[PDB]
């Protein structure tokens, strides 16, 4: 109980953006001291922010594990007749990385990107078999550090290993698969009422909806084929570049024998 | 303490695949009764599986919240000199859904797909602004139920609302951004030693690595443009189909005046 530092993982930084919780649906009469009291069981807080009138707040805890337990224990709990909503806040300094060679590790990715500023986390995304997907995520402590990493890697050629594969850096798309789109918000849409008139169904042959849908599916099948062809054409161009460059290199070494 | 049912969220099913934890690096002398004792604090277990010789096990807890707390409290804890690894198991019956209209909700998606078998969870993926991305996830309790949903929606025209948008059902790609690719596994690769010889760097002008990388980047820029063009061409074909079908429908209604 006294040593909460036991929840910190090896090499984990403390009070990162991954330790930040959002709390929504707070009663309008909440105080900052009361909001701190709600999280007192989870050690010393880092940043604390409350917006009384909109009933929401932010709090940073010491470790990811502490934040996960606090989220699990406080989410959907009542406070003066309001069920609280506790969620992890969205990361404001995260970047996607791609064109990673198969031997690039989480630690190498962190070493490399640390030159642009302090890293909270860097990870190589792997498939169900543990093989690299060639993609990764880099999370910086601040937005300027991410912006430098993004600008420098786009302007210059950032290489991680002997084999010169340039890292491609792009902003990370932050998507929500937790709350998603609840009926309560979809109801607010003006078309919703007319849209729910026809329930879920399999379209019947000899109807306009079946004809339109079958034709739409054939266009979607065509799009996938065209996408797959572009990928194959450009992969062939990339492989031809690799061979041309290796031949030019071997011709150079020959001139130096 | 006595009523663990308080951690179950509204409408949440109990003992789902989302309540299943994987535990790795168990000592070779573990017993099933001892493995159950490690999780006794987290209520009655569901399915329990242990493989003694490989030092791993699976356990199902009552609610997602219970599983998150157990994961957070037991991960990286010592057991007879071995640090345990606790993770959420991968879902074995999950499907991706796309071409969803903007007023399709999590609840509608669940209602619809429940005809193929019991649903554990169905969710519409939303962006940072809460707007539908047009994509969703459907998690079934069993593999045959997912296979039916996948086969029927591919063969037939499954529609969710009045506006006939066919749902496109595809298997969900299960990727790992938690453990990723650690150095300990990348080290096992035969090229790793030769690959780490050249440290992370910006390539210098007037080198073969700079020339190859700049040319590779221009081919990657070309691929993105070609991908974006295919998308635009096929979107124009889809929009033209929508107009042709609406005109054919209005011509039909005219014949019925």
UniProtKB/Swiss-Prot annotation, chains A, B:
Residues found modified as Phosphothreonine: 90
Phosphotyrosine, modified sites: 15
Superkingdom of source: Eukaryota
Post-translational modification: The N-terminus is blocked.
Annotated positions of the N6,N6-dimethyllysine modification: 36
Modification N6-acetyllysine occurs at: 41, 60, 143, 194
Entry text on domains: The coiled coil domain mediates interaction with NONO, and can also mediate formation of long, linear homooligomers (in vitro). The coiled coil domain is required for optimal DNA binding, and optimal transcription activation.
Designated name of the protein: Splicing factor, proline- and glutamine-rich
UniProt lineage: Eukaryota, Metazoa, Chordata, Craniata, Vertebrata
Full-length numbering of the shown residues: 279 to 535 of 707
């Amino acid at each position: 109980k006294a040593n909460l530092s036991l929840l910190r993982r090896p090499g984990e930084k403390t009070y990162t953006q991954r330790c930040r919780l959002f709390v929504g649906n707070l009663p309008a009469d909440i105080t900052e001291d009361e909001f701190k009291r709600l999280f007192a069981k989870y050690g010393e807080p880092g940043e604390v922010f409350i917006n009384k009138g909109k009933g929401f707040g932010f709090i940073k805890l010491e470790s990811r594990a502490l934040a996960e337990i606090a989220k699990a224990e406080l989410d959907d709990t009542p406070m003066r007749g309001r069920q609280l909503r506790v969620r992890f806040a969205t990361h404001a300094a995260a970047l996607s990385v791609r064109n990673l060679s198969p031997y690039v590790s989480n630690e190498l990715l962190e070493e490399a990107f640390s030159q642009f500023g302090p890293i909270e986390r860097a990870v190589v995304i792997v498939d169900d078999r543990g093989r690299s997907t060639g993609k990764g995520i880099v999370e910086f402590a601040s937005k300027p550090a991410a912006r430098k990493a993004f600008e420098r890697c786009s302007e210059g050629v950032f290489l991680l290993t002997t084999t010169p594969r340039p890292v491609i850096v792009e902003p990370l798309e932050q998507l929500d698969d937790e709350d998603g789109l609840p009926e309560k918000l979809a109801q607010k849409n003006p078309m919703y009422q007319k849209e729910r008139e026809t329930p879920p169904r399999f379209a019947q042959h000899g109807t306009f909806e079946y004809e339109y849908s079958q034709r739409w599916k054939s266009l979607d099948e065509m799009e996938k084929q065209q996408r797959e062809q572009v990928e194959k054409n450009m992969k062939d161009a990339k492989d031809k570049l690799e061979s041309e460059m290796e031949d030019a290199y071997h011709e150079h070494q020959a001139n130096l024998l």
